[PDB]
Amino acid sequence: XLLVTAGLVLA
Amino acid sequence: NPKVFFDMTVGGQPAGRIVMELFADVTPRTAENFRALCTGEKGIGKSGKPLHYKGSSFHRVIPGFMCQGGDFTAGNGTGGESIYGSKFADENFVKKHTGPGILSMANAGPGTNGSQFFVCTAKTEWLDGKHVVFGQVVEGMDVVKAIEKVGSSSGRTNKPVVIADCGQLS
Incomplete structure (x- = not known):
């Protein structure tokens, strides 16, 4: 999807 | 409120200067962390590298969404x-993602704020x-728009x- 993460990029 | 720049x-x-106002009057802890990482004030972190955004990159850019950076460590x-x-910790969620130029913390779930941030393009x-x-x-x-232009899905x-350079403006 459209997330903003730090390590595991999700959908 | 302090103003910092990239x-x-x-x-x-060279693409220009991005100038950011930090909401210290709403998020004092989060603002101060960002502000300090702009100046390099604090010197060397536990990682052995300067607590400083200078020289770091935007490693994740999605056009029409946001530009992500803040990894001066790895x-x-x-x-x-x-x-x-x-x-x-997540200091508070008073401020909302209301449009382009919004400056917000990237994380890995609740209470995992580090130095990684993102600038919204919508x-x-x-x-x-x-x-x-x-x-x-x-x-x-407009400089952020130039960054957005080189992004991908x-x-x-x-x-x-x-x-290329960064610091505090006021």
Whole structure:
């Protein structure tokens, strides 16, 4: 999807 | 409220100055962390590298969404380090993702704030309550547009986007 993460990029 | 800046290069070419106002009057802890990482005030972190955004890159850019950076530790999106000696709590979620230039904290779930941040290139309402908004681009949003232009759907840039210089403006 459209997330903003730090390590595991999700959908 | 303090104002900090990034002088950017895109593909080695100077692209301009991004000027950001930090909401210290709303998010004092989060603002101070960002502000300090702009000046380099605190020196060397536990990672052995300067607590300083200078020289770091935007490693994840999705056009129409946001530009992500803040990894001055590993320089690959896995690193980053706050000034508090560890990851810090979500201070509050008073400020919402209301449009372009919104400056917010990237994380790895609740209470995992480090140094990684993102600048929105549109409204990102779905991130409300999950990511601490702590600033707003007030000058040089056109520079962010130049960064957005080299992004992709995967988030991979096609030119290196670098913070050539950075610091505090007021």
